[PDB]
């Protein structure tokens, strides 16, 4: 279990969960305030 | 049109002929 | 038995003795052809090398030329054919300017496949190239004309 | 030929000359290092610059090195 | 005494593993010191030679990895079939195939990539597929969504079963070595088990369920008032309605009266005219013809009775003159190593694939087929891709067989040593025929051009002046029309629309095949063909040949078979390695595949495919320009590239601009390729120490020190995103020129 | 020491390739590299292939150096046998070369005298300028 | 039954004559007379290249400055008027 | 010399840790080792190497 979390806490699984938040994060703004070119 | 008939096909056959045996043999001496 | 030996017996020269290189009919078609007439005055060679050369040549030129389908067809493929035998033996000629020496002596082998010694080709020598080229030169030119003859005349 | 050069950093570990594939190094008593010994190239005729000897030492910077110079048929590694 | 050998627990399962990157390398198990060190990590992962000395344990790695492999595949086309179940319009299709563009993905909305989802028919949105899969379930006789779905179900089901089987066969139950090595066996099984009884059972499929259904299709009646599947064989009267041989169920089958199955066994050939594929009676019989055939064959080799052959016996029984001791040796060779097995698969593999992408275009095995034009595109270009990629590895392994595994002390063949003593021989031959190719194919392409420029089309090589026809392929070709009549009685039609006598067939007003003419161009373009091919096996058979020594470096094999090089020294020594031959291979396979695909697209498109008017007027794609445009490189520039990219070029706006994407984003990544190639990693060490001693200014600069890249990882990333961008270039060119236009 | 004789010694058995001698070693040099095996066994061939190689003396022409050192270093290695090598000119005359003074250059061995070395740092190398106009190289001094 | 020997460099290395022949002159005495007298003046190198670049040289010039316009379309000229090019631009 | 376990500062222009630290080993009190300083460093250098020696010109003990 402490080897299966030091997994978890490798540079890819790490790196695909981190830009996986994010990309969901920018999705759902970009969805609720579309189209924006300010601010 | 005369002179080109004389001097074309003296500096694009002829003249790289010469040159270039010339050079070989020079190159390979 | 097996087929494929060692060249001439010796399994560490970079060869090998195949039905190709050495059988009875290619060893003795290939020795009975003018470059390997090793005891042979060279311009002999040479007038039938070139002869042979410049007859195939007169071939290709005529039909395939820019005037093939013109009156003038042999004239201008016999020209050309006429031509590649200069460049080639100017090409032959500063070969052999630059290859021997007037003094240097043959460089083609001095053994037989037996092993015994014979007389070097003079054809590796300067005179001997040199007639050799003008063998080429002299037979070619002929060739071309005897073709263009055979072939218009 | 090739040049090759033994710098006195050296420390004797052997490793260039058993790493040449055409035998140009060797080694000879030295008292600079504690492995009393030190590298050179007494047969660079034979050298063909691959730098495979460069790749073995371990030295900071290297004590082994080769300055590609004169091409020749040895050095050109050439067969024929 | 062939059996069942297996070890017990062999590996405990732990993630103890999971958490020690690079567990299966002592080296690269000590951690990172420079950046190197997970590259390395990479490029070593699946190397299980370079992980033990031991075969069994390789052979088991191998074993439990292919049941990954095919976990993987089985997920692939679970979500294939689950998308063509839910995110489809595959229905609508089957109520109107020829006005219907098949689509089976969906995009979702948000910023602004909606427009994807263009209208492909049926009232639905999306993106229009070319992989083929409605034609191929329709060929089923799949009409619901449900079915779909439930096939979507039983492939992940798959799925879990092949994952469980690679754990299973890896950590629980680990067979032996002489299991693997049981050849005769494995032969026997695969010859009858899988190949044999697949094709008998799936012609089962074929007989009870695809035929009625298709006939009903075909017939006009609505899917959904098609008799389900089971019932076809719950109720013998509707097959017997259908083809009244089931009326004597199996028994004219036991009594030898098999005349009286020729209701749905045929022999026809051609295609069906109210569909444009192959008669589905034709391909049933096919199936139960090849499945008898393979069925026979399984039954060739000696196990554990006396009967059978042996493989070494075989082997050793043929030895010429010329060969001294021929074929003895090689049984041990490949009962003891992997990578001459995976070379010789992989050739055959590969070639089989290309094999498949042909004879897919000429004989269309699928309802609405050969005129869904993209789907046809895409398959032949994919195929035929995928067939030289295999090749090349093919010759990768073959060479790493050469490096890792030959060993003429203990494992000798006298047939490769005798390859070995004349490879000079051999590749100076394969040099001089390339060369000799080149010119008098490439050559003549340049000699038509300068004529063409000079004004003096009478002298180029064409139809209409000096002319070079395909006198044996047209011979060929009418022998071939000719066949049913002679060679062939049994057969109707021929096997092909495309040789040189027949009809013509059409479905939809488009044209599915005709008799495709063969001219001056096909000869040029088929003797380029052989030309790319000839230097393709030139550099991939020198790279094999010399890899373990050669005149300049008499012990490259102590190299290995992944190296840069050896040195600067003898001139220079850059790219010796047989990898670095697969490297340049690859960029030649490119080249030849490049050039057959737009052989291909050219061709159908100019000389086969079009529109079909009333009273038999056919209006080509590219009305036939063909013959008298791809006998110039600059007709190839303007007629071919130039004028088809249009569709691709002005793909913005509309639902294929993600193809335009495509393009754009190809050609970007193919330059940026160049700038591997091209370069050396010495400047970028630098680069990289002038940026380090920024990072270490501001206090960042990383433990795992950064490193510029391997000159082989330069090489390896240089050739993939060449590739990479290359063929999707094409890619997006063929997908959205055929879209658009077909 | 006095160097090694080289006699005419039979050669190993071998089909023949075409990785052979061609017209260097007629014209310029060839290479002759001799050992002594406890058996008939096979081993491979710098120019590629397989040879046998008999009990007692053998005596093998390659074209290159390295090919004599690689098939040695081969032999030392693998079969834990001692070789020698010589360079040979067309006029008959031969060159001991292999190893020089009958010890291996790995270990040291009194008597060599050093060549090219320069007791000095290698960062210590004047700049190329400090050469200009002369003959001679930065490390060269 | 070896291949080595100091004495005979010549063998060793295998510096053999594979197809020539020490069979004398099987050509045509009168034939060969006619050439020998006949090819001679080529066969001095030197001169032989001067008389063949300055001979190549002159008969080039010679068919080239004479060609007929039934042969060369270039010494033909054109024979159709002149288009306007582009912009009105003669 | 400097002691053992000392942290000194490069001087030799040609070294990878050139104008970095390092940690002292031990010095060989042999007067005729021309680089008796054996110096061991925290990254490793382009040929994977983390020690090397010096000589008593080519170290400057700082803190
Ligand atoms: C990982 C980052 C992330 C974040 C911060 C959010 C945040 C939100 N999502 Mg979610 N969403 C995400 C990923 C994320 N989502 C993913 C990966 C999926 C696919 C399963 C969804 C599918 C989804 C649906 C179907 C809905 C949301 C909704 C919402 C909003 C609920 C209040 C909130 C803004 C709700 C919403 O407000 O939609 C308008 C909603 O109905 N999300
Ligand atoms: C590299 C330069 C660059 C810049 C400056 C932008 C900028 C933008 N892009 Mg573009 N884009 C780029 C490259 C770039 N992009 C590339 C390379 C692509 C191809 C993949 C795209 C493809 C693309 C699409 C398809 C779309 C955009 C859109 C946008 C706009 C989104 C506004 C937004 O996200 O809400 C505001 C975002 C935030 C406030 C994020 C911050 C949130 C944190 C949590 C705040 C924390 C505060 C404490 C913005 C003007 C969208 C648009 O509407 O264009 C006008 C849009 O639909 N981009
Ligand atoms: C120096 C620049 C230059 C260039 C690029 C050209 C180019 C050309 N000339 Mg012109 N020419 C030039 C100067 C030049 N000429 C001068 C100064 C004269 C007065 C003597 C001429 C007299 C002349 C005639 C009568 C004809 C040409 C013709 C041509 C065309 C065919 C080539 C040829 O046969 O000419 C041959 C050129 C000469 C005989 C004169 C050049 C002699 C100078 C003094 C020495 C040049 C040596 C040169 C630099 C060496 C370069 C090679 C070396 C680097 C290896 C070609 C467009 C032909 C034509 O117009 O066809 C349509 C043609 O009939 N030229
Ligand atoms: C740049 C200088 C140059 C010039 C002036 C020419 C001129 C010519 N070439 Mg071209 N050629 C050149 C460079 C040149 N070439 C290059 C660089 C290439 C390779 C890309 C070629 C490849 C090429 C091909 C494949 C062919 C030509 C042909 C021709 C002839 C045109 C066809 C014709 O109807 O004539 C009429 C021609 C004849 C009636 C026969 C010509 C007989 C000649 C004049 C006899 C000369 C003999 C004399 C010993 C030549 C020695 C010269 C040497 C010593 C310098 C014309 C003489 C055609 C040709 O040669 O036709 C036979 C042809 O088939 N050329
Ligand atoms: C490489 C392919 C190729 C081929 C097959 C041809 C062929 C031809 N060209 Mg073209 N050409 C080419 C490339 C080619 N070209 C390229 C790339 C260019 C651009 C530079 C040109 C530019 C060009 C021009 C400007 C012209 C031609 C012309 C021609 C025609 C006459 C050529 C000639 O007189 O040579 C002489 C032919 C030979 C010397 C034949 C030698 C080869 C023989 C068969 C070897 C035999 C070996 C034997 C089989 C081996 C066994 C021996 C054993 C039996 C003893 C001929 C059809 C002329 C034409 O008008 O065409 C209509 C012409 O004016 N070409
Ligand atoms: C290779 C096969 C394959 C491919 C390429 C796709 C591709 C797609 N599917 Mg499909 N699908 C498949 C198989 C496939 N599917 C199978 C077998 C099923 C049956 C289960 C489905 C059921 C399905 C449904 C119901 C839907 C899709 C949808 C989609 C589309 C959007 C995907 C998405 O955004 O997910 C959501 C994105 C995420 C979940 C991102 C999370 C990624 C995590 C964070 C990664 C974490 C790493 C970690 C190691 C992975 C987990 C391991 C696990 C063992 C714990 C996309 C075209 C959607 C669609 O087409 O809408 C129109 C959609 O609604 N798929
Ligand atoms: C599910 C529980 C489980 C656990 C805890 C283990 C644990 C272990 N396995 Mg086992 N094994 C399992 C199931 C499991 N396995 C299954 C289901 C299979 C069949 C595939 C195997 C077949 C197998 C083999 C052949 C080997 C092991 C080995 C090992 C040991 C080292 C492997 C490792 O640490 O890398 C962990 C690996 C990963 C975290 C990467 C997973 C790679 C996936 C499966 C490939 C598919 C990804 C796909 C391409 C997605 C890409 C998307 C896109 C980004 C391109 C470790 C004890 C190795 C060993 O014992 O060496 C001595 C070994 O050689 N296992
Ligand atoms: C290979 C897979 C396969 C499978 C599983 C089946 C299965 C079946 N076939 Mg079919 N059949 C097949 C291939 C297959 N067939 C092929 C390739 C042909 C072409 C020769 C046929 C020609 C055929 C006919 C003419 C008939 C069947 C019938 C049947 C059914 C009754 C058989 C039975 O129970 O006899 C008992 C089993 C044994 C004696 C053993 C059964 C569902 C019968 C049917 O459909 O009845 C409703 C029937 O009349 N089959
Ligand atoms: C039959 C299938 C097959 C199998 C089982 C193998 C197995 C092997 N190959 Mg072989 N090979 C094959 C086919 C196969 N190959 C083919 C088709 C080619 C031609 C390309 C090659 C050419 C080849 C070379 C040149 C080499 C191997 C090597 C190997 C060994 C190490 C592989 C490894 O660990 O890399 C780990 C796997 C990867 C690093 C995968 C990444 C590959 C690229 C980056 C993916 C391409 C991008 C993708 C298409 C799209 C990306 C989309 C997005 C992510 C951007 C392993 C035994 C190596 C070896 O040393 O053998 C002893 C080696 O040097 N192979
Ligand atoms: C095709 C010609 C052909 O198949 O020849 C067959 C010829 C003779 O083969 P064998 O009869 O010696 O082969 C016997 C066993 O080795 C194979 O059963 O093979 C060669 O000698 C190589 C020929 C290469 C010729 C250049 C290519």
Redesign the pocket.
């Known amino acids: 279990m402490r080897d299966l979390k030091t997994?978890l806490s490798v540079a890819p699984v790490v790196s695909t969960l981190w830009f996986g938040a994010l990309a969901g994060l920018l999705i759902e703004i970009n969805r609720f305030f579309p189209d924006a070119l300010i601010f | 049109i005369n002179l080109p008939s004389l001097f074309v096909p003296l500096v694009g056959l002829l003249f790289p002929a010469v040159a270039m045996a010339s050079l070989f043999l020079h190159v390979e001496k | 038995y097996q087929v494929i030996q060692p060249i001439n017996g010796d399994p560490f020269i970079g060869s090998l003795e195949t039905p190709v290189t050495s059988s009875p009919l290619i060893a003795w078609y290939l020795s009975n052809l003018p470059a390997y007439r090793t005891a042979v005055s060279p311009l002999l060679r040479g007038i039938e090398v070139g002869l042979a050369h410049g007859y195939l040549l007169v071939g290709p030129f005529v039909k395939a030329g820019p005037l093939r389908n013109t009156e003038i067809a042999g004239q201008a493929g016999s020209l050309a054919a006429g031509g590649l035998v200069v460049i080639l033996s100017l090409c032959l000629t500063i070969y052999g300017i630059s290859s021997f020496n007037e003094g240097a002596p043959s460089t083609a082998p001095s053994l037989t496949l037996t092993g015994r010694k014979k007389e070097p080709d003079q054809l590796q020598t300067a005179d001997g190239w040199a007639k050799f080229t003008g063998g080429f030169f002299f037979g070619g030119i002929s060739g071309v004309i005897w073709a263009y003859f055979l072939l218009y005349v | 030929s090739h040049s090759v050069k033994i710098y006195d950093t050296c420390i004797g570990c052997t490793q260039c000359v058993r790493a040449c594939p055409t035998d140009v190094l060797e080694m000879i008593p030295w008292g600079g290092c504690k492995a009393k010994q030190i590298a050179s190239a007494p047969r660079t005729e034979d050298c063909v610059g691959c730098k495979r000897c460069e790749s073995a030492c371990p030295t900071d910077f290297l004590s082994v090195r080769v300055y590609l110079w004169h091409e020749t048929t040895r050095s050109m590694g050439l067969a024929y | 005494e062939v059996k069942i050998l297996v070890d017990r627990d062999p590996?405990?399962?732990?993630?103890?593993?999971?958490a020690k990157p690079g567990?299966?390398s002592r080296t690269i198990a000590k951690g990172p010191d420079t950046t190197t060190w997970i590259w390395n990590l990479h490029a070593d992962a699946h190397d299980f030679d370079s992980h033990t000395s031991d075969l069994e344990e390789i052979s088991?790695?191998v074993f439990?990895?292919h049941?990954?492999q095919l976990?993987?595949i089985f997920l692939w086309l679970s979500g294939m079939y689950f998308h063509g179940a839910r995110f489809s319009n595959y229905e609508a299709w089957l109520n109107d195939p020829t006005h219907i563009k098949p689509s089976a993905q969906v995009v979702w909305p948000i910023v602004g990539q909606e427009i994807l989802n263009g209208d492909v028919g049926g009232g639905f949105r999306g993106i229009q597929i070319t992989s083929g899969f409605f034609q191929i379930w329709r060929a089923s006789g799949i009409t619901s969504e449900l079915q779909l779905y439930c096939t979507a179900i039983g492939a992940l089901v798959f799925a879990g079963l092949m994952?469980?089987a690679?754990?299973f066969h890896?950590?629980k139950a680990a067979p032996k070595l002489a299991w693997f090595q049981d050849v005769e066996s494995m032969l026997n099984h695969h010859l009858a088990g899988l190949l044999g009884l697949g094709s008998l059972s799936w012609a089962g499929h074929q007989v009870h369920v695809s035929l009625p259904i298709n006939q009903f299709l075909n017939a006009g009646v609505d899917p959904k008032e098609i008799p389900l599947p089971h019932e076809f064989i719950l109720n013998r009267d509707l097959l017997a309605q259908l083809y009244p041989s089931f009326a004597e169920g199996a028994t004219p089958f036991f009594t030898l009266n098999w005349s009286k199955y020729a209701d749905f066994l045929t022999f026809r050939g051609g295609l069906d005219p109210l569909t444009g594929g192959l008669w589905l009676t034709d391909i049933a019989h096919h199936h139960l013809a090849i499945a008898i055939l393979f069925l026979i064959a399984g039954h060739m080799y000696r196990t554990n009775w006396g009967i059978g052959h042996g493989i070494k016996d075989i082997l050793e029984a043929h030895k010429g003159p010329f060969t001294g001791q021929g074929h003895k040796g090689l049984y041990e060779i490949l009962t003891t190593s992997w990578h001459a097995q995976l070379s010789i698969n992989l050739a055959m593999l590969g070639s089989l694939t290309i094999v498949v992408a042909q004879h897919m275009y000429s004989m269309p095995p699928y309802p609405y087929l050969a005129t869904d034009y993209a789907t046809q595109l895409s398959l032949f270009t994919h195929h035929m891709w995928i067939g030289g990629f295999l090749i090349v590895g093919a010759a990768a392994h073959a060479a790493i067989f050469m490096v890792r595994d030959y060993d003429p002390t203990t494992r000798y063949n006298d047939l490769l040593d005798r390859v070995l003593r004349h490879r000079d021989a051999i590749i100076s031959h394969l040099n001089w025929v390339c060369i000799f190719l080149g010119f008098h194919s490439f050559g003549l392409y340049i000699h038509n051009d300068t004529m063409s420029a000079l004004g003096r089309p009478q002298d180029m090589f064409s139809d209409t002046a000096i002319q070079l026809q395909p006198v044996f392929a047209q011979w060929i070709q009418n022998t071939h029309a000719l066949a049913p009549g002679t060679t062939a009685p049994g057969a109707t039609a021929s096997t092909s629309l495309t040789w040189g006598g027949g009809d013509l067939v059409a479905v939809g007003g488009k044209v599915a095949l005709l008799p495709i003419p063969l001219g001056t161009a096909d000869f040029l373009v088929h003797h380029i063909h052989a030309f790319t091919i000839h230097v393709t096996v030139l550099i991939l058979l020198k790279g094999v040949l010399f890899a373990r020594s050669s005149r300049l470096i008499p012990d490259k094999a102590n190299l290995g078979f992944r190296f840069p090089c050896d040195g600067p020294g003898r001139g220079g020594t850059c790219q010796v390695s047989a990898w670095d031959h697969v490297f340049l291979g690859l960029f030649w396979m490119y080249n030849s595949i490049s050039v057959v695909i737009f052989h291909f697209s050219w061709k159908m498109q100019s000389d086969v495919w079009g529109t079909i008017n009333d009273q038999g007027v056919v209006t080509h794609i590219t009305a036939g320009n063909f013959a008298q445009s791809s006998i110039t490189i600059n007709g190839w520039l303007r007629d071919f590239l130039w004028a088809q990219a249009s569709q691709v070029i002005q793909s913005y706006g509309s639902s294929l601009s993600a193809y335009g994407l495509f393009f754009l984003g190809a050609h970007f990544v193919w330059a940026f390729s160049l700038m591997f190639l091209f370069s050396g990693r010495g400047y970028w060490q630098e680069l990289i120490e002038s940026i380090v001693w920024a990072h270490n200014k501001l206090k960042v600069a990383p433990a795992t020190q950064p490193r510029a890249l391997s000159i082989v990882q330069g090489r390896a990333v240089g050739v993939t995103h060449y590739l990479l961008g290359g063929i999707a270039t094409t890619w997006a060119f063929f997908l959205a020129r055929i879209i658009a236009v077909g | 020491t006095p160097p090694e004789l080289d006699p005419n010694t039979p050669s190993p058995i071998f089909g023949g390739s075409t990785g052979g001698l061609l017209r260097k070693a007629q014209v310029e040099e060839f290479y002759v590299i001799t050992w002594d095996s406890p058996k008939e066994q096979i081993f491979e061939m710098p120019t590629g292939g397989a040879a046998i190689m008999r009990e007692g003396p053998n005596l093998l022409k390659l074209a290159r150096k390295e090919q004599c050192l690689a098939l040695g270093t081969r032999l030392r290695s693998k079969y834990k046998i001692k070789y020698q090598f010589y360079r040979v000119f067309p006029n008959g005359e031969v060159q001991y070369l292999h190893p020089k003074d009958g010890v291996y250059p790995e270990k040291v061995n009194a008597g060599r005298q050093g060549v090219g070395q320069n007791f000095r740092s290698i960062g210590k190398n004047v700049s190329p300028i400090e050469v200009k106009f002369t003959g001679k190289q930065p490390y060269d001094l | 039954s070896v291949y080595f020997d100091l004495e005979d460099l010549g063998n060793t290395t295998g510096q053999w004559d594979s197809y020539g022949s020490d069979a004398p002159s099987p050509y045509n005495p009168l034939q060969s007379k006619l050439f020998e007298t006949f090819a001679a003046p080529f066969t001095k190198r030197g001169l032989l290249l001067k008389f063949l670049i300055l001979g190549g040289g002159s008969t080039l010039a010679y068919l080239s400055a004479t060609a007929s316009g039934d042969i060369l379309p270039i010494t033909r000229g054109p024979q159709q008027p002149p288009k306007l090019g582009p912009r009105g631009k003669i | 010399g400097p002691k053992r376990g000392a942290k000194v500062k490069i001087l030799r222009k040609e070294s990878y840790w050139y104008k970095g630290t390092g940690s002292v080993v031990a010095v060989d009190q042999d007067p005729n080792t021309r680089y008796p300083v054996v110096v061991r460093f925290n990254k490793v250098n382009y040929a994977n190497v983390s020690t090397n020696n010096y000589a008593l010109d080519e170290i400057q003990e700082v803190e």
């Open positions: 997994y | 590996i405990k399962t732990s993630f103890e593993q999971w567990h299966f088991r790695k439990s990895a049941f990954g976990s993987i994952l469980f690679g754990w890896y950590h």
